């Protein structure tokens, strides 16, 4: 379901190896290496992203889920590339926005999402009205939460 070009893979390996100690930069060693989030978050292609902390956690397959291997780094790039299908992009956006990882976007997830975006912070009343507007347009079943199909549907209607 995901795609990579040869150029993307080759350029990604060069960028990933720059994050490694000199002794782990060979092809064989770099493919076994785990880069801590601190080094990943410093990458110019990710440093400005308001969701960078969540992006790292969603793509990590490491034992303590605190680092990225080259394989995780490529998984990340295949989703963020221009080749990724709208269905892949909305599937992973849902995982990134699900701050508690339970399968639905609730009011706290939406408030955390807004706070990531704004960093001038909204008043309690402005946040309440914005969450109410998001839920009115996205929560079809009116259960108070946004599931994956509701989310993919509202994203497919994007202005």
């Amino acid at each position: 379901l995901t795609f990579l070009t040869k150029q993307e893979i080759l350029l990604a390996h060069r960028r990933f190896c720059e994050l490694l100690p000199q002794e782990q930069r060979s092809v064989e060693s770099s493919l076994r290496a785990q880069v801590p989030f601190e080094q990943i978050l410093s990458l110019p292609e990710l440093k400005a992203n308001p969701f960078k902390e969540r992006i790292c956690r969603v793509f990590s397959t490491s034992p303590a889920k605190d680092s990225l291997s080259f394989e995780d780094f490529l998984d990340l790039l295949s989703v963020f590339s221009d080749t990724a299908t709208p269905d892949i992009k909305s599937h992973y956006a849902f995982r990134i926005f699900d701050f508690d990882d339970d399968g639905t976007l609730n009011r706290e997830d939406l408030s955390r999402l807004v706070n990531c975006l704004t960093g001038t912070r909204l008043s309690a009343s402005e946040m309440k009205q914005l969450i109410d507007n998001i839920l009115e347009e996205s929560d079809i079943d009116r259960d108070g939460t946004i599931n994956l199909s509701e989310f993919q549907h509202v994203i497919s209607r994007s202005p």
């Binding site: 992203n49 992009k89 914005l130 998001i134 509202v154 994203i155 994007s158 202005p159």
Partner: peptide, 15 residues
């Protein structure tokens, strides 16, 4: 404005 919000949220993530 739900739809406008999601456009800005997706653009902040993928743009």
């Amino acid at each position: 404005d739900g739809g406008s919000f999601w456009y800005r949220a997706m653009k902040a993530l993928y743009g």
